Design a protein around this ligand. Structure first.
Ligand code: NH4
Ligand code: NH4
Lengths: 405, 405
């Protein structure tokens, strides 16, 4: 069947506002985590986050940004970058039935959802709400807010699966290409950063709370003293294109998506089973005869989550343990945006031939001994890489990408 | 490729808590719209809705329902119904890598989103929020809350696309079967009914407000005096299964999904373009050598909305227009659940050989001139039906189902 490759990428993350800034942060093991006065004032125990260091005001047409929440803004900016990076002129992707968009978020917009309710209960009622809350608060906000302005005529919808959200978006994009239904599918996601949603995770005990005085050390995947993830926001978008189409226009190809796994744990609600993850990685490796040179793990930085994934990786590769690093130690967990941003970090490592370090590991977890966890930036010729996205609700996605000759 | 058929269904709507009750309401053109004190007390202009008349108290185990929002509850109950109706037992669908679940909601759970914010802002903070808000508030709540209890091991995620949400879910399930990845995929969705979310649509001027005195007449699709849709809640689930697998176990086959259309308008944020709908319908009809006997249109019952679809239908068929009926006139708009529920209504009509009436039409709009709009329950031998789902963001989905030879 049809082959799918990545020909462009765009990103707005806690460690950079474009792929160049991100590249630098990755090589330097630079943290994007900072202290959040907003989270502290909300009454939360976790006072750190991976915020986007950019004032988006005026970066998007007023008539367009009026319908958007932060998730949409981040994804929109990421898509602009992706389009330019892919070298696509407007005439090349706009008003084209074979060009689509699949992008979502983990929670839509709790901020505007609460805003509407707060305004409605106020002295002005509906007048305070406004006619833009729906497009900001709906779960499909990210796809709706981008498909319209970019004149997308092909597939258009959002996929939601918590931490696996944008990973499933990319995989679904691949499926469209494989089915011969689309030539190009923009895939990715975005996530707003707000106490409204963050407090829900803190109320679960899923967020780090013992390192508020040293924010850059809070996210410490695989460290013996990890205590939860650090919430983050941002966006990302990649251009998934059918091979012949990309080659025909002389597109720059980062890699071919040679594997996509999507499975379900069917066990616990908010706790990885590990078993589902093993099946997910094996599914993504079907037909892939080249070894995995680097694995960008889910690596949430949670006590139980980290160990479950470690076990799954051991079961899948056994003696074939590849280089492993959890970029979340640097970036925080962007939820709905994580899958696409992490695929992008993996693509940058593959393109520039280096492995980003898994930082803040002062004491490697006992259940990690024997694995090749990279803790220092290492230059190496990579050919095949894997990125795992295992999210709450027992939903799993794995992407395997490989360089073309 | 592989063929996909529906072997079971389940539904919880404003006009029936199961397919039997729904079937009864459809034949008599009964309305599920009622006066809502909740919507009035909130300060909204629209005081009518399509509530689910059912006491779900104790219908779901404690340990399971504690993670669910109303959208998940309705979806869960619909899935139980679907499993039984399909003749499936745990040994056949549980812990099975080839059985998946694709279901979502349009807005997740505004109610628990606001609940978490309200509780957090209280003196108790995190303690008042509780550790169950995430699974209720997240956009993937519907898929996560069902996949776990039903021990689903295959694909697991939610698709969101406003009014087309559950229609795209069914289409994606078909794709999984065509790709040979799954033998069975439960597809559908759910939507809660609350002022929290309802006020967003009212502030947008999309909800009917000139009939709060005569609820059962508020929703009046294709009527010259329409003034917005009536918000509704509920759930739906269908069992999508690979043909040979279904025949092998002697399952009851309602129909085969012979067409699935998915397009994008890339024009306006909250207004159909028509151009996109036309392409969507043609996409679903492509390859279908059999004519469409019945069409369950979007029929939102909005001034511009209704006009656009009719024009699109006229453009697709023209002089050869099939029987058309807007079930939302009696059921309302269940948003994320509308796609699967309307697919089910179309299946019941196809299964029992009859056409549901388009109630509340005193004066047919001039736009529906050369079209066959059924306003009375008519008995006919249907073979091929079509269901259109066009939501905000310019996202379109069309399903074509036909009896099996
Ligand atoms: N990852
Ligand atoms: N429909």
């Amino acid at each position: 069947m049809k082959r799918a490759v990545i020909t462009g990428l765009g990103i707005v993350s806690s460690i950079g506002n474009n792929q160049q800034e991100v590249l630098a942060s990755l090589r330097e093991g630079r943290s994007g985590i900072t202290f959040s006065q907003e989270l502290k004032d909300s009454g939360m125990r976790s006072h750190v986050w991976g915020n986007v260091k950019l004032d988006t005001t005026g970066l998007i047409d007023r008539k367009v940004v009026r319908f958007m929440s932060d998730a949409s803004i981040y994804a929109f900016l990421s898509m602009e970058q992706a389009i330019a990076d892919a070298g696509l002129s407007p005439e090349a992707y706009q008003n084209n039935p074979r060009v689509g968009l699949i992008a979502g978020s983990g929670g839509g917009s709790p901020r505007f959802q609460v805003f509407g309710a707060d305004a409605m209960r106020g002295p002005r009622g509906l007048k305070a709400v406004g006619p833009y809350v729906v497009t900001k608060a709906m779960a499909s906000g990210v796809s709706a807010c981008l498909a319209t302005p970019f004149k997308i005529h092909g597939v258009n919808y959002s996929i939601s699966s918590a931490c696996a959200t944008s990973a499933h978006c990319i995989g679904n994009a691949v499926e469209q290409i494989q089915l011969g239904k689309q030539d190009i599918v923009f895939a990715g996601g975005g996530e707003e950063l707000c106490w409204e949603m963050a407090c829900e995770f803190d109320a679960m005990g899923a967020l780090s709370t013992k390192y508020n005085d040293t924010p850059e050390k809070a996210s410490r995947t695989y460290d013996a003293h990890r205590d939860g993830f650090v919430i983050a926001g941002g966006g990302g978008m990649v251009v998934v294109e059918e091979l012949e189409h990309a080659l025909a226009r002389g597109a720059h190809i980062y890699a071919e998506i040679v594997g996509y796994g999507a499975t379900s744990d069917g066990a616990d609600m908010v706790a990885p089973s590990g078993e589902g993850a093993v099946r997910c990685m094996k599914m993504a490796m079907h037909g892939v005869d080249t070894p995995i040179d680097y694995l960008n793990s889910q690596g949430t930085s949670t006590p139980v989550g980290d160990v479950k994934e470690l076990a799954a990786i051991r079961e899948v590769f056994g003696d074939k343990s590849p280089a492993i690093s959890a970029t979340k130690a640097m970036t925080g967990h962007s939820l709905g945006a994580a899958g696409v941003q992490e695929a992008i970090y993996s693509l940058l490592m593959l393109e520039h031939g280096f492995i980003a370090p898994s930082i803040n590991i002062e004491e490697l977890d006992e259940q990690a001994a024997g694995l090749n966890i990279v803790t220092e930036t290492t230059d190496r010729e990579l050919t095949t890489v894997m990125s795992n996205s295992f999210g709450f609700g027992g939903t799993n996605a794995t992407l395997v990408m490989r360089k073309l000759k």
